[PDB]
């Protein structure tokens, strides 16, 4: 109970060595700094970053998002129907396969 | 009781150490402890500071860790440095100067160990080429205020030279703690040593540059000079055909040759004169 | 002294930054600009910046709290 | 050029007017700051 | 009740390595150092011990520390080689006694001899009186191929402590091949 | 020169004040009252300064 | 191996106050400490340093004492606060290099195979840099020894970081350059160069005076370099050189001529503008 969350945004480009410009999930865009120990070679435009909620500094980069809808759509099939239960259209099945 | 004329004296090394340490860990609040002495009860001198290991995944560290502090204190003595601790310091990046809620409890321990400690707060990213932001505070108790009395009895007018910022007033400040004045002690030896920065060797002032890029640069400059010369008279002619109330706003989107040519003239004259003079004396310095 | 004084005004540029679009300049050192938050403002211009670069649809950076052109 | 700059400031005269921002706006600013601090 | 800081000065020359004793004189040094350091540890718990070697040019193995195992491990890997440079070894030992954390402690230096020494009379008397000037006491253990009548050593006794005080002592060579540590067990407390 | 320097310092000081909105007025009223409408909010009836 | 070394003011201030606090106790002549820094390509950077107990006797240059455990535990202790730093070399504040330097360098080459020696002068009196950088190497010649240990110099300079820059700028309130232009481009470059060249020639004069009268350890590499120096002086009496020089100078002066003309025109325009704008102000008062 001694930790706080961080806002999530997307980087657009860097002005100089210590200044980037990033866009949150919502509208507003900010000119922000970055952490000293963090690597600067991975911050290509389009990546997703996490910013502090009181100073808005680059802290960490993250992989691409996966929507919960797409996750649900990815795997939902408890059925186990095989080719023996379907008959009468042995040519269209070959055409599809 | 305590007075408003209390003074604190900070050396140069301590300032630079704490500034560098605070700037290194910008996104969080790093902390350390100072050391010095109390020559009297009006002025407190601090002579050296040292950082301390922190626990990550946060922005605050408890100061209770006796092993490291004891080891550093008993090891510094072996090479001089018989001084004792006088207080602690921590940095607020881009906020200002105040004491957060936990900070009162944090400084309560030092107050209990020694009733005349002090807390120093440095702002590492709000200072540029001077005007470093450093403040010093001490706590007060509310029971004495219940008695209808106020601390820091005033005996002179040198304690109220700086008006506090509005953000310090917004937080606790005078109803929870009081700030004290600050000063930097300077001597001639370190100041004379420190001014050697950016000084260049005697070789850099006798080289006379290549005689091939110089003519290219002059040729480049002359053409833009010509174009600005052509564009000057157009703006000269229409200087009064329009009312002067909107004259200033007329030059808000497009450049003006009058301001944009003087810099060309200046750089060109300087380069040519210095390049001539260098060769002039070099022709006779060597043989 | 003036050379030293001209440099102390850069204290208002470190972290507080919001990106906005320049809209109009009513007169000298005062303008109206529209932030990306979604509202317009009538604000004051910093003196030392070069007025020549203020083109109709340029993008500028503003103070977070005072919301002044920086 | 030097001669020209030597004949520069002769016509200006009686420019004692020196006003920075205002006269009584400081009181209003201080009152607003105190009101914000109190709240 | 004395707080004492001890410096051990161990020889590893090519004459010391001679093996007239039942084991090599190396093991005599090891077990003698063991018993003396143990005696000094039970003498006072917060005492500390440092170690230096005698060679062509002397060199220190461990700065004054209250630990014991590091000293034993460091001396266990020594290899017998070199000559004796007693004077410079004593000088650098005295240097090591300074810059010591125990400013209130009492100085003590113990030295080993197992090789002939080319000492100079005027040099040794000057060194002895200088070391007296800074209130330094030295105990010396001679064994193996002893110096002729320890006569040079005798000069130290004439010059160093031994007159108007018992702050210094000398142990003669034990000729017998038997364990010399048991024989020297008494003088270390009766010195 | 002195006036320029002092003006620069005061200009540094006076840049930490709030901005002012822009709005469209629909119609006025009596005893110094007007009705205005600023787009990211509703309609406000306000007064007028003395100048 | 090493091309340039960069020194921050922090280590300079640390050297100064270490020297002060250890020399106040007694009359010591030389003090020793160990540096911390970083590498990148062939450029070395020095960040901070800490002291170490050291003793040396003036009676002989073959007796001295350092502390191993102190250095080890202090490095381990600084490791827990910043892991980027590492041991790079050592410094001694002696006015000139001593005989024991080779022995100490060999002693602490264990912790860094590429140790770099740095000499800092604590009371400089000239405009030259206070720091000098050396690196060990093995040299070979005809007879005497197959190899011998010898120091070689490496270029050094004083750098600055942003926080260090603002700190030193706040500390240097009293002294600041008057103007930036031909002034700083001339005095800071040319006169100082003449000063340094004269000082170097005076030093080599002194060494040459020491020979053929006094000690006389005739060394041959110095003689070879002196012959090379005295053979490389150009001749300025040649006709073609004079013609080329005159051609280039005549080519260069026209640009200054043109710039002066433009400045005069701009000044006249400013005078006209001011006079016209100001003559229309007296009648407004009535």
From Swiss-Prot, chain A:
Disulfide bond residue pairs: none
Localization in the cell: Cytoplasm; Nucleus
Modified residues (N6-acetyllysine): 23
Transmembrane segments: none
Function description: Component of the 26S proteasome, a multiprotein complex involved in the ATP-dependent degradation of ubiquitinated proteins. This complex plays a key role in the maintenance of protein homeostasis by removing misfolded or damaged proteins, which could impair cellular functions, and by removing proteins whose functions are no longer required. Therefore, the proteasome participates in numerous cellular processes, including cell cycle progression, apoptosis, or DNA damage repair.
Family as reported in the entry's similarity comment: Belongs to the AAA ATPase family.
Subunit structure: Component of the 19S proteasome regulatory particle complex. The 26S proteasome consists of a 20S core particle (CP) and two 19S regulatory subunits (RP). The regulatory particle is made of a lid composed of 9 subunits, a base containing 6 ATPases including PSMC6 and few additional components. Interacts with PAAF1.
Protein's name in the database: 26S proteasome regulatory subunit 10B
The organism's taxonomic lineage, starting at the top: Eukaryota, Metazoa, Chordata, Craniata, Vertebrata
Gene: PSMC6
Parent-protein residues present: 50 to 146 of 389
From Swiss-Prot, chain E:
The UniProt record lists the keyword Repeat: yes
Keywords noted in UniProt: Isopeptide bond, Phosphoprotein, Proteasome, Repeat, Ubl conjugation
GO biological process: proteasome-mediated ubiquitin-dependent protein catabolic process
Functional description taken from the UniProt entry: Component of the 26S proteasome, a multiprotein complex involved in the ATP-dependent degradation of ubiquitinated proteins. This complex plays a key role in the maintenance of protein homeostasis by removing misfolded or damaged proteins, which could impair cellular functions, and by removing proteins whose functions are no longer required. Therefore, the proteasome participates in numerous cellular processes, including cell cycle progression, apoptosis, or DNA damage repair.
Family label: Belongs to the proteasome subunit S5A family.
Taxon lineage: Eukaryota, Metazoa, Chordata, Craniata, Vertebrata
Subunit (UniProt): Component of the 19S proteasome regulatory particle complex. The 26S proteasome consists of a 20S core particle (CP) and two 19S regulatory subunits (RP). The regulatory particle is made of a lid composed of 9 subunits, a base containing 6 ATPases and few additional components including PSMD4. Interacts with NUB1. Interacts with SQSTM1. Interacts with UBQLN4. Interacts with UBE3A. Interacts with UBQLN1 (via ubiquitin-like domain). Interacts with DDI2.
Protein name: 26S proteasome non-ATPase regulatory subunit 4
Cross-link (Glycyl lysine isopeptide (Lys-Gly) (interchain with G-Cter in SUMO2)): 122
Superkingdom of origin organism: Eukaryota
Source organism of the structure: Homo sapiens (Human)
Limits of the VWFA domain: 5-188
UniProtKB/Swiss-Prot annotation, chain F:
Signal peptide: none
Subcellular location: Cytoplasm; Nucleus
Record's function text: Component of the 26S proteasome, a multiprotein complex involved in the ATP-dependent degradation of ubiquitinated proteins. This complex plays a key role in the maintenance of protein homeostasis by removing misfolded or damaged proteins, which could impair cellular functions, and by removing proteins whose functions are no longer required. Therefore, the proteasome participates in numerous cellular processes, including cell cycle progression, apoptosis, or DNA damage repair.
Family the UniProt entry places it in: Belongs to the AAA ATPase family.
Record's subunit section: Component of the 19S proteasome regulatory particle complex. The 26S proteasome consists of a 20S core particle (CP) and two 19S regulatory subunits (RP). The regulatory particle is made of a lid composed of 9 subunits, a base containing 6 ATPases including PSMC5 and few additional components. Component of a complex with USP49 and RUVBL1. Interacts with PRPF19. Interacts with TRIM5. Interacts with NDC80. Interacts with PAAF1. Interacts, in vitro, with the thyroid hormone receptor (in a thyroid hormone T3-dependent manner) and with retinoid X receptor (RXR). Interacts with ERCC6.
Protein name: 26S proteasome regulatory subunit 8
Segment of the intact protein contained: 52 to 102 of 406
From Swiss-Prot, chain G:
One GO location term (cellular component): ficolin-1-rich granule lumen
SMART domains assigned to the protein according to its UniProt record, in alphabetical order: JAB_MPN
Keywords on record: Acetylation, Isopeptide bond, Proteasome, Ubl conjugation
Gene Ontology BP annotations: proteasome-mediated ubiquitin-dependent protein catabolic process
Classification via Pfam families: JAB (PF01398), MitMem_reg (PF13012)
Domain MPN intervals: 5-140
CDD domains: MPN_RPN7_8
PROSITE patterns: MPN
Sites bearing N6-acetyllysine, chain numbering: 200, 210
An example molecular function term from Gene Ontology annotations: protein homodimerization activity
Misc remark: Does not bind a metal ion.
Function as written in the Swiss-Prot or TrEMBL entry: Component of the 26S proteasome, a multiprotein complex involved in the ATP-dependent degradation of ubiquitinated proteins. This complex plays a key role in the maintenance of protein homeostasis by removing misfolded or damaged proteins, which could impair cellular functions, and by removing proteins whose functions are no longer required. Therefore, the proteasome participates in numerous cellular processes, including cell cycle progression, apoptosis, or DNA damage repair.
Protein family membership: Belongs to the peptidase M67A family.
Oligomer status and interactors: Component of the 19S proteasome regulatory particle complex. The 26S proteasome consists of a 20S core particle (CP) and two 19S regulatory subunits (RP). The regulatory particle is made of a lid composed of 9 subunits including PSMD7, a base containing 6 ATPases and few additional components. Within the complex, PSMD7 interacts with subunit PSMD4 through their respective MPN domain. Interacts with TRIM5.
Name this protein carries in UniProt: 26S proteasome non-ATPase regulatory subunit 7
């Amino acid at each position: 109970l001694q930790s706080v969350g961080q806002i999530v945004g997307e980087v657009l480009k860097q002005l100089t060595e210590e200044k980037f410009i990033v866009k949150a999930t919502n509208g507003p865009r900010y000119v922000v700094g970055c952490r000293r120990q963090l690597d600067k070679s991975k911050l290509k435009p389009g990546t997703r970053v996490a910013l502090d909620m009181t100073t808005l500094t680059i802290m960490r980069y993250l992989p691409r998002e996966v929507d919960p809808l797409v996750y649900n759509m990815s795997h939902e099939d408890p059925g186990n129907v095989s080719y023996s239960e379907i008959g009468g259209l042995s040519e269209q099945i070959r055409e599809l396969r | 009781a305590v007075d408003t004329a209390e003074q604190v004296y900070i050396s140069s090394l301590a300032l630079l150490k704490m500034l560098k340490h605070g700037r290194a860990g910008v996104p969080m609040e790093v902390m350390g402890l100072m050391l010095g002495e109390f020559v009297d009860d009006y002025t407190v001198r601090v002579i050296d500071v040292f950082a301390m290991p922190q626990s990550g995944t946060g922005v605050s560290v408890e100061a209770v860790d006796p092993v490291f502090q004891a080891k550093m204190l008993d090891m510094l003595k072996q090479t001089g440095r018989p001084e004792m601790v006088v207080g602690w310091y921590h940095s607020h990046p881009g906020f200002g100067c105040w004491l957060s809620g936990v900070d009162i409890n944090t400084q309560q321990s030092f107050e209990a160990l020694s009733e005349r400690a002090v807390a120093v707060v440095v702002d590492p990213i709000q200072s540029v080429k001077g005007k470093v932001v450093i403040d010093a505070f001490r706590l007060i108790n509310a029971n004495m205020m219940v008695l209808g009395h106020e601390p820091r009895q005033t005996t002179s007018n040198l304690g109220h030279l700086n008006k506090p910022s509005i953000q310090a007033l917004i937080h606790g400040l005078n109803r929870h703690y009081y700030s004290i004045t600050i000063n930097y002690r300077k001597n001639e030896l370190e100041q004379k040593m420190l001014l050697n920065l950016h000084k260049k060797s005697w070789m850099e002032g006798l080289t006379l540059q290549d005689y091939s890029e110089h003519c290219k640069h002059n040729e480049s400059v002359v053409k833009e000079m010509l174009e600005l010369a052509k564009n000057y008279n157009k703006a000269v002619e229409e200087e009064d055909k329009m009312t002067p109330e909107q004259l200033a706003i007329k030059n808000v989107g497009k450049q003006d040759p009058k301001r944009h040519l003087e810099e060309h003239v200046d750089v060109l004259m300087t380069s040519n004169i210095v390049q001539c003079l260098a060769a002039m004396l070099d022709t006779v310095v060597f043989k | 002294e003036f050379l030293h004084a001209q440099e102390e005004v850069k204290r208002i540029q470190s972290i507080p930054l919001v990106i906005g679009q320049f809209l109009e300049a009513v007169d000298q050192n005062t303008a109206i600009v529209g932030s990306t938050t979604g509202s317009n403002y009538y604000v004051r211009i910093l003196s030392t910046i070069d007025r020549e670069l203020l083109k109709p649809n340029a993008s500028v950076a503003l103070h977070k709290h005072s919301n002044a052109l920086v | 050029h030097n001669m020209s700059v030597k004949a520069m400031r002769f016509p200006p005269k009686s420019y004692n007017k020196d006003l920075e921002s205002a006269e009584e706006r400081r009181e209003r600013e201080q009152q607003d700051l105190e009101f914000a601090k109190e709240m | 009740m004395v707080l004492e800081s001890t410096m051990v000065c161990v020889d590893n020359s090519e004459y010391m390595r001679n093996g007239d004793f039942l084991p090599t004189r190396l093991q005599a040094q090891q077990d003698a150092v063991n018993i003396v350091c143990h005696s000094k540890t039970r003498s006072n718990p917060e005492n500390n011990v440092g170690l230096i070697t005698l060679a062509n040019d002397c060199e220190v193995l461990t700065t004054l520390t209250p630990d014991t195992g590091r000293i034993l491990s460091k001396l266990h890997t020594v290899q017998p080689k070199g000559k004796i440079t007693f004077c410079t070894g004593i000088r650098v030992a005295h240097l090591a006694l300074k810059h010591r954390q125990g400013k209130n402690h009492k100085m003590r230096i113990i030295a080993f001899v197992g090789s002939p020494v080319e000492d100079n009379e005027k040099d040794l008397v000057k060194l002895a009186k200088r070391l007296k000037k800074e209130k330094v006491n030295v105990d010396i253990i001679n064994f193996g191929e002893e110096e002729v009548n320890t006569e040079k050593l005798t000069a130290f006794v004439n010059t160093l402590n031994g007159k108007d005080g018992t702050g210094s002592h000398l142990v003669t060579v034990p000729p017998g091949p038997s364990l010399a540590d048991a024989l020297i067990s008494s003088p270390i407390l009766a010195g | 020169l002195n006036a320029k320097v002092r003006l620069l310092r005061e200009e540094l000081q006076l840049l930490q004040e709030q901005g002012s909105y822009v709005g469209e007025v629909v119609r006025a009223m009596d005893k110094k009252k007007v009705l205005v409408k600023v787009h990211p909010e509703g309609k406000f009836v306000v007064d007028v300064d003395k100048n | 191996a090493v091309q340039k070394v960069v020194v921050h003011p922090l280590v300079l201030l640390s050297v100064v106050d270490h020297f002060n606090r250890i020399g106040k106790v007694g009359n010591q002549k030389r003090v020793v400490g160990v540096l911390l820094g970083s590498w990148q390509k062939k450029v070395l950077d020095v960040s901070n340093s800490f002291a170490v107990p050291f003793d040396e006797d003036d009676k002989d240059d073959s007796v001295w004492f350092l502390d191993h455990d102190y250095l080890e535990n202090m490095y381990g202790m600084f490791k827990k606060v910043n892991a980027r730093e590492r041991i790079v070399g050592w410094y001694h504040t002696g006015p000139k290099l001593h005989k024991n330097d080779i022995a100490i360098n060999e002693l602490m080459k264990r912790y860094c195979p590429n140790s770099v020696l740095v000499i800092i002068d604590v009371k400089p009196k000239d405009l030259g840099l206070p720091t000098e950088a050396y690196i060990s190497v093995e040299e070979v010649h005809d007879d005497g020894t197959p190899t011998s240990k010898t120091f070689e110099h490496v270029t050094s300079e004083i750098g600055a970081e942003e926080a260090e820059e603002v700190g030193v700028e706040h500390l240097l309130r009293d002294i600041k350059d008057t103007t930036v232009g031909t002034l700083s481009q001339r005095i800071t470059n040319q006169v100082h160069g003449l000063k340094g060249l004269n000082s170097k020639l005076l030093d080599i004069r002194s060494y040459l005076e020491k020979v053929a009268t006094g000690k006389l350890p005739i060394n041959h590499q110095i003689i070879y370099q002196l012959q090379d120096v005295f053979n490389l002086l150009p001749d300025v009496s040649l006709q073609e050189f004079v013609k080329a020089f005159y051609l280039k100078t005549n080519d260069q002066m026209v640009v200054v001529y043109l710039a002066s003309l433009i400045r005069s025109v701009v000044a006249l325009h400013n005078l006209i503008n001011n006079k016209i704008a100001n003559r229309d102000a007296e009648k407004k008062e009535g």
